[PDB]
Amino acid sequence: MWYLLWFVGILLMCSLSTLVLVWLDPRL
Amino acid sequence: DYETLRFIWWLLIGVILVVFMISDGFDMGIGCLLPLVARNDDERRIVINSVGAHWEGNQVWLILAGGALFAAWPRVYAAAFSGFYVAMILVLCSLFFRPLAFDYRGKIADARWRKMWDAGLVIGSLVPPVVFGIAFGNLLLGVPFAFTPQLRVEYLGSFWQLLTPFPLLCGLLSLGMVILQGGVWLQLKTVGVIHLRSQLATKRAALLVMLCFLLAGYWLWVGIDGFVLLAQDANGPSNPLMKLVAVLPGAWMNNFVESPVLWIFPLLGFFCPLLTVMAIYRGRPGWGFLMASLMQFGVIFTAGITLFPFVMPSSVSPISSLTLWDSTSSQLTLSIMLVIVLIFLPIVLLYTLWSYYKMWGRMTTETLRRNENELY
Amino acid sequence: WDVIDLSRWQFALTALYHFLFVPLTLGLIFLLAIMETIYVVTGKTIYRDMTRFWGKLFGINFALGVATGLTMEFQFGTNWSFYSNYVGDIFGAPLAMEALMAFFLESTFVGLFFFGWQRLNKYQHLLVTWLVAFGSNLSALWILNANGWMQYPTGAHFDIDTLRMEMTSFSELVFNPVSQVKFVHTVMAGYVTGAMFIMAISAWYLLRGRERNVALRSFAIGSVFGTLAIIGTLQLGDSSAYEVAQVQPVKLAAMEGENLMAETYPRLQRGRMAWLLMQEISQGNREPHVLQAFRGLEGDLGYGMLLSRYAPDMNHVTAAQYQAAMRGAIPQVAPVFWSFRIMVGCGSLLLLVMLIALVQTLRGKIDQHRWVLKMALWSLPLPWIAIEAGWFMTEFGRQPWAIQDILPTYSAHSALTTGQLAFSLIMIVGLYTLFLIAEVYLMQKYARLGPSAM
Ligand SMILES: CC(C)=CCC/C(C)=C/CC/C(C)=C/CC/C(C)=C/CC/C(C)=C/CC/C(C)=C\CC/C(C)=C/CC/C(C)=C/CC1=CC(=O)c2ccccc2C1=O
Ligand SMILES: CCCCCCCC/C=C/CCCCCCCC(=O)O[C@@H](COC(=O)CCCCCCCCCCCCCCC)COP(=O)([O-])OCC[N+](C)(C)C
Ligand code: HDD
Ligand code: HEB
Ligand code: HEB
Numbered sequence: 001m002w003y004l005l006w007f008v009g010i011l012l013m014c015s016l017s018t019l020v021l022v023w024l025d026p027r028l
Numbered sequence: 029d030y031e032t033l034r035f036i037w038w039l040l041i042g043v044i045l046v047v048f049m050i051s052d053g054f055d056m057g058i059g060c061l062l063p064l065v066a067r068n069d070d071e072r073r074i075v076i077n078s079v080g081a082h083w084e085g086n087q088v089w090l091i092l093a094g095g096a097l098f099a100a101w102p103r104v105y106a107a108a109f110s111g112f113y114v115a116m117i118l119v120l121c122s123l124f125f126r127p128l129a130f131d132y133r134g135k136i137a138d139a140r141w142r143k144m145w146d147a148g149l150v151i152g153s154l155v156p157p158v159v160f161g162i163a164f165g166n167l168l169l170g171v172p173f174a175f176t177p178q179l180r181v182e183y184l185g186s187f188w189q190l191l192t193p194f195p196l197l198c199g200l201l202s203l204g205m206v207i208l209q210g211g212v213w214l215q216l217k218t219v220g221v222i223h224l225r226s227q228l229a230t231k232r233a234a235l236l237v238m239l240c241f242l243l244a245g246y247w248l249w250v251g252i253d254g255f256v257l258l259a260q261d262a263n264g265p266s267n268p269l270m271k272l273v274a275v276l277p278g279a280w281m282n283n284f285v286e287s288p289v290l291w292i293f294p295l296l297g298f299f300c301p302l303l304t305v306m307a308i309y310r311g312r313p314g315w316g317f318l319m320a321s322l323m324q325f326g327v328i329f330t331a332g333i334t335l336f337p338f339v340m341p342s343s344v345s346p347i348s349s350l351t352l353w354d355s356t357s358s359q360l361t362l363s364i365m366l367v368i369v370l371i372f373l374p375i376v377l378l379y380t381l382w383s384y385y386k387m388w389g390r391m392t393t394e395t396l397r398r399n400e401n402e403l404y
Numbered sequence: 405w406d407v408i409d410l411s412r413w414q415f416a417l418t419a420l421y422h423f424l425f426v427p428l429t430l431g432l433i434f435l436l437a438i439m440e441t442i443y444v445v446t447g448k449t450i451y452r453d454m455t456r457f458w459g460k461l462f463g464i465n466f467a468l469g470v471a472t473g474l475t476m477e478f479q480f481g482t483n484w485s486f487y488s489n490y491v492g493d494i495f496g497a498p499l500a501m502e503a504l505m506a507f508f509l510e511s512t513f514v515g516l517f518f519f520g521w522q523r524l525n526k527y528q529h530l531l532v533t534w535l536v537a538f539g540s541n542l543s544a545l546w547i548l549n550a551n552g553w554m555q556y557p558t559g560a561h562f563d564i565d566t567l568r569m570e571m572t573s574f575s576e577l578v579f580n581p582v583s584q585v586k587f588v589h590t591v592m593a594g595y596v597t598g599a600m601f602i603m604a605i606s607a608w609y610l611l612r613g614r615e616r617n618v619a620l621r622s623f624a625i626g627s628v629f630g631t632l633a634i635i636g637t638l639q640l641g642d643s644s645a646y647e648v649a650q651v652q653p654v655k656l657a658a659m660e661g662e663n664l665m666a667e668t669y670p671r672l673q674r675g676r677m678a679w680l681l682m683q684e685i686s687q688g689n690r691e692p693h694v695l696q697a698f699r700g701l702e703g704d705l706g707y708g709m710l711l712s713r714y715a716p717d718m719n720h721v722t723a724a725q726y727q728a729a730m731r732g733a734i735p736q737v738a739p740v741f742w743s744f745r746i747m748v749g750c751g752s753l754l755l756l757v758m759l760i761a762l763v764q765t766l767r768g769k770i771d772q773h774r775w776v777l778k779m780a781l782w783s784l785p786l787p788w789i790a791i792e793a794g795w796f797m798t799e800f801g802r803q804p805w806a807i808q809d810i811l812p813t814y815s816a817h818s819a820l821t822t823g824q825l826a827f828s829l830i831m832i833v834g835l836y837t838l839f840l841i842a843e844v845y846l847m848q849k850y851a852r853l854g855p856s857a858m
Contacts, residue, residue: 002584002643003545006591010434010541013595013632017438020628020766021621022446027768028620081519084470085512092503094477099500102492102568109481109488110818116482117828124471124835128842131467135846177686179567181485182819265565357493358563358570365497372504376512383512386523401858402519 031262031353033362037100038339038352040369042332044096048089049205049324055083057210057233059126059153060203062146065214065225072146073134073403074391078217080130080404081387085380087126090156099365103266103355104339107181108163111173114187115159122155130404154203161202164331165195168248168280170255170343175268184344194247201240205324207233212304212320215313219392230308230316234301241298241327248334254279255341260353268354273346280334290333296326408817410825411483414832418479419799420792421836422472425843427791428465430544430591431598431633433537436462436517438625440530454618455533456521457855458602461847463518468843470511475832482828487806487816493570494560494577495550495807502546509539544594545587551798552583556651557807562702564685564695569810582647586798589640592633593794596754597787599630600780603761605851607780610771618855620770623780627765631758638751648801652808655801658740668707668733671809672726675708677701679718682708706810707733713814735803743797750790757783 058079066072079086097105109116125148133145169192172185211230215223248254256279258272284290300323307316335341340350356362389395396403436459443451477499480488488496516524516532524532553560559576560569571577603626609619648655653664678701684694707729708718714728715721761780764770771777802808806816850857 001579002588006541006588009636010591013629013636014434014438014441016632017625017629018441018445021438021442021451021625024624024765024768025442025446025448025621028617028624028770081515082512084515085508087470087474088503088507088511091474091477091507092500094481095496095500095503098480098488098492098496100496102488102496105481105492105496106485106488106818109478110483110485110820113482113818113820113824114827116478117824117831120475120478121831121835123474124839127467127470128839131463132842132846135464135850178683179489179686180819181489265563267566357496358566360571360574361493361497364571364574365500368501368504372508376504376508380508380512383516386516386520386528389523399522402521 030359034352034356037362042329044093046325046328048093050321051086051089053206053209054213055079055086056153056157057206058214059149060207061210061229064229065222071222073396077391077403100357101355104350107173111183112163119156119159122152125152134404157202157206158199161199162190162195165198166190170341172344173342174345175348197240197244204233204236209320212313212316217391219390227308231305234305237301248280253277255338255349257337262353266354266356268348268350273349275346283333283336293326293330293333296322297330300326407820407822407825408814411817414829415479418475422476425465425469427594427597429469429540430594432462433540435598437533437537440533444526444530454622457858464847468839483818484816485818490568490811491807498546498550502543506539506543510536541591544591548587548590549583552580552586554807556580556582557810585643585647589644592637592640593791595633596630596637599626599633600787602626603780604784607777611777615854615856623770624765627761631762634755634758658737658744662737665730665734668730671704671707672711672729674701674704676711676721678705679708709815710812732804740797740801743793746793747790750786754786
């Protein structure tokens with residue numbers, strides 16, 4: 001069911017963006 | 029059952045219209061008051077920033093009015109918005125200017141640009157209340173629309189037909205209503221010369237509301253033929269052609285004459301402006317806002333109860349008059365939409381209260397100086 | 405011009421104008437949510453300043469978005485009164501639910517986003533930004549549920565007594581497969597739009613050697629988010645293609661590289677019969693054989709209503725009228741084919757751009773190659789191009805239907821005159837031209853000024 005998939009997926013997208021930026025920020 | 033659902037949805041439409049007036053009406057009234065109570069750039073920004081945080085959420089009440097009409101009364105939504113086509117285009121065009129004025133006024137340090145956006149805000153604050161009042165007055169006069177047997181709607185009037193003296197009086201009264209609401213909001217949200225000028229505008233708007241409301245009631249009672257619903261099955265299907273209507277002089281007074289308890293609604297509409305002025309004089313703009321809110325409640329529910337059971341009487345085809353018994357959605361739709369409304373309107377109301385609570389504070393010159401680049 | 409065509413073009417222009425600003429809102433607000441989340445997690449103020457700058461651009465876009473949405477809400481009543489009457493029992497529900505759940509959330513809390521930076525503590529402001537994001541996306545959910553129902557009408561039945569489509573099951577509306585995939589695809593496209601926006605503006609900064617740190621971080625956020633977004637966009641685009649393959653043969657024929665015409669003639673015949681029976685029902689007949697015949701033929705009332713346009717005498721429909729309606733049942737396949745192609749090809753270009761940006765992002769060499777920045781800068785229009793193509797395909801590929809196989813567009817219209825439509829078109833177009841020029845100007849000016857001017 002796509003609404004649940006979207007909810008989980010947008011949580012995952014924002015979480016991955018946050019985590020990647022936390023990791024990469026010292027390199028920047 | 030179907031009848032109870034339909035009456036509850038009538039109540040809900042009226043409630044939504046009242047909440048629109050209460051919330052977004054003070055935005056519209058403050059836009060109207062902006063050239064009255066603000067005479068320089070700082071005063072103008074203070075006035076605009078008194079509603080900047082909430083005006084959009086408030087306007088969602090107008091949007092919900094439209095959407096709840098669509099969902100619960102699709103016949104009314106269709107017939108009204110197509111019949112008042114030019115009036116609605118004028119309202120929409122004026123409404124364009126508000127989000128744009130709010131965001132863009134401070135984006136260019138040009139006197140001409142700020143003047144353009146102040147004027148546009150005034151247009152978008154003035155035109156919608158006036159047109160809504162004219163529209164409701166035309167409801168009371170009867171609207172020149174009709175249904176085909178296949179329930180397709182035909183309009184036989186025009187924008188100029190609406191601009192008769194009674195609908196003009198109703199538009200003036202609606203303008204006075206929003207201006208009163210905005211004047212009490214400016215009272216609670218500002219200080220100084222703006223506060224003084226909004227106070228005086230509040231007194232003037234309340235006097236206008238009282239005079240216009242009394243004149244319109246007298247006119248309805250003595251010189252406007254009312255509609256009477258002779259026979260209509262209130263649990264029956266939403267088909268306006270299955271009913272019997274008569275257009276008798278003085279008929280609009282029938283609901284109140286039969287049931288003297290319903291007289292409280294016009295009493296609220298007429299006297300709540302005076303009590304709003306009294307509260308403003310008493311140094312109590314919170315009680316004044318409550319009284320202005322009850323004025324909106326009383327005036328709108330007075331219009332509804334006068335029209336009840338009609339919502340949209342037809343001046344050229346009385347059987348084509350729309351009622352709360354024949355303009356509605358299906359029983360399933362009414363039930364499920366009622367459930368959804370009963371869930372979310374409390375939640376919306378609570379988090380709207382939350383937002384207003386967190387943002388509560390008076391916009392002043394020092395507030396503006398502290399946050400000049402951030403604010404509208 | 406026919407007043408119906410003026411109304412079609414009016415809704416065309418106003419929806420397109422509204423969705424010049426919506427996709428940016430949809431994606432940019434989650435980008436702001438991510439920036440503020442990073443600020444909360446790390447305490448690094450640069451992400452707060454990024455939230456404020458990119459949100460200023462967000463507000464510029466959001467204001468026009470709100471106004472254009474206002475046009476759309478009441479256009480259904482103004483120009484499509486028969487549409488409103490005929491399908492409101494189902495269609496007005498997702499719009500109302502949008503107002504109730506989503507519009508209130510986003511509009512209420514966008515004011516807190518812009519003006520609650522101080523009155524809210526860090527966590528409450530983060531929550532408010534997230535609530536704006538989820539409200540705008542839930543508005544996408546419900547309005548796209550309505551539009552999907554237009555593509556695939558489910559859980560509805562015609563009521564003889566009210567002469568309109570009525571709801572049968574709310575769950576068949578809410579979980580309409582078309583609406584599900586439409587929602588997720590469109591919001592993914594909006595995420596792509598926001599990501600490409602911040603990446604392009606950051607690349608412009610980096611090419612001029614200015615705002616370097618904000619530009620680097622904003623490019624990185626855009627790279628990761630928009631890589632995920634464009635991937636999800638492509639996958640949900642394939643899902644949408646599958647669903648419209650199931651329920652809309654015309655849009656299926658568009659992607660196939662362009663039978664149904666011929667099939668529509670038996671449906672036209674049954675529809676003519678259903679239309680005659682429905683006129684009888686409107687006349688108040690309730691004879692048993694009449695209602696049994698109508699229950700047998702009510703699945704083609706839409707084709708009968710379509711035939712009504714090409715046959716003034718529905719009792720005696722000549723073959724020429726049959727063939728006119730036959731041709732008019734199928735829209736021109738070429739605008740839909742080329743719309744689909746732009747959308748897909750722009751998606752492929754966006755995927756390449758996002759992957760290169762992400763590789764340079766993960767390597768920590770965003771500013772290493774100038775051509776990466778130039779490509780990101782020049783890729784800014786692509787999401788809007790693909791999005792308007794997708795919506796053109798969506799809204800032209802269901803023609804001539806306002807509701808697929810239920811309500812023809814030519815039958816959904818209000819009773820208006822070319823004078824009223826000329827007035828609304830002139831006013832709307834002139835005002836929109838002024839507003840678009842002003843908004844593009846302000847957006848350009850404040851993006852050019854950049855975060856340092858904040
Ligand atoms: C209210 C309710 C439960 C349900 C609503 C029912 C209803 C008809 C809803 C309208 C639905 C339709 C057709 C909507 C489309 C048209 C339209 C305006 C759409 C926009 C909706 C919005 C946002 C409306 C906002 C309302 C606004 C701003 C203005 C209209 C309100 C006004 C001023 C109505 C006129 C009030 C009036 C003059 C009453 C006369 C009098 C005097 C007595 O002094 C009296 C004294 C004693 C007895 C009587 C009087 C006495 O009538
Ligand atoms: C079918 C669907 C249609 C819809 C499409 C819509 C797409 C919307 C996107 C439109 C933007 C498209 C821009 C083209 C990309 C290349 C830019 C470029 O060439 O540089 C130029 C502009 O660059 C700037 O100076 C602006 C600085 C960055 C601000 C970005 C513009 C914001 C537009 C916000 C628009 C509102 C968006 C929200 C509403 C839509 C020149 O810069 P220069 O420094 O002078 O360079 C000198 C050197 N040179 C001359 C040799 C080059
Ligand atoms: C995929 C998303 C999407 C689509 C297809 C549409 N909209 Fe929209 N609309 C939004 C997403 C959105 C939004 C993202 O929620 C907006 C954009 C910016 C904003 O303020 O909210 C918005 C605002 C918005 C507003 C102002 C609401 C408010 O300010 O609270 C109204 C009244 C509408 N829309 C109505 C419509 C109608 C009637 C559409 C049908 C043609 C429509 N929108 C298409
Ligand atoms: C909910 C609902 C809805 C929605 C959301 C939408 C959304 C949209 N849209 Fe829409 N439409 C509609 C509903 C709608 N819609 C209608 C109803 C119509 C009518 C019919 C026709 O087709 O016209 C239209 C129509 C239309 C058009 C025209 C077509 C023809 O041919 O006619 C166009 C172009 C468009 C676009 C669009 C877009 C771009 C979008 C994105 C935003 N549209
Ligand atoms: C980012 C941008 C974008 C992109 C990239 C894309 C990519 C894509 N896509 Fe898209 N779309 C869009 C944006 C877009 N898109 C839109 C906007 C639309 C409109 C809305 C809907 O969904 O409808 C569409 C729509 C659409 C559709 C239809 C739906 C309906 O009709 O309902 C389809 C089928 C598709 C497919 C697709 C694909 C296949 C792809 C590749 C993989 N689409």
